[PDB]
Design a binder for this molecule. Structure first.
Ligand SMILES: CC(C)CN(C[C@@H](O)[C@H](Cc1ccccc1)NC(=O)O[C@H]1CO[C@H]2OCC[C@H]21)S(=O)(=O)c1ccc(N)cc1
Lengths: 99, 99
């Protein structure tokens, strides 16, 4: 799709068979979801944003479907204000900025 | 232009006698720049993201030039680690997400 930016670019995603809303976020290097259960091993990690650093759980090679487009990559779980799809997955679905 | 997302979407912007690098950020509601001393009236504000909140000054009707495209609107100023062009100005320069 072509998505304009008068509203937040929130899209429904499928992750672990569950539907969630997430923000397409070109200023995020990484993908972070609010607290949820994901299967398999995770690695403790820390990441920084505008307001400081947080601790997250890093899950590798997680399939996610974003508006019907498949990605498989790293998903962090931690105290983000909203679920965010970052460039690690936006690149996999072929997303670009255009003006 | 078309900007891919393999790397951070940093572009040159002009805000006064300052040429700066800023992130084209679909996950940011409003433009926020690193500490600088802009002219007019303003309003204190707190903006939140990963790690918590920062205090900023909100300035209105500030003209900026983004890759040669003119914009004019709200610019927040505060201790952000990265200059960010948010949706408030991305819309004005005709920027969309496409996949
Ligand atoms: C978390 C988002 C809902 C909101 N943020 C914009 C977001 O794009 C920031 C923008 C950003 C970019 C770099 C540094 C700080 C903030 N990215 C971010 O936090 O990404 C994190 C996940 O991937 C990592 O890569 C970048 C930081 C990590 S925000 O910076 O907090 C923000 C919030 C409000 C406004 N008006 C402007 C910006």
């Amino acid at each position: 799709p072509q998505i304009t930016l008068w509203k937040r670019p929130l899209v429904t995603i499928r992750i672990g068979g569950q539907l969630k809303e997430a923000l397409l976020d070109t200023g995020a290097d990484d993908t972070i979801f609010e607290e949820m259960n994901l299967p398999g091993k995770w690695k403790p990690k820390m990441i920084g944003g505008i307001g400081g650093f947080i601790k997250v759980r890093q899950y590798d090679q997680i399939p996610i479907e974003i508006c019907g487009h498949k990605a498989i990559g790293t998903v962090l779980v931690g105290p983000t204000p909203v679920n965010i799809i970052g460039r690690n997955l936006l690149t996999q679905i072929g997303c670009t900025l255009n003006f």
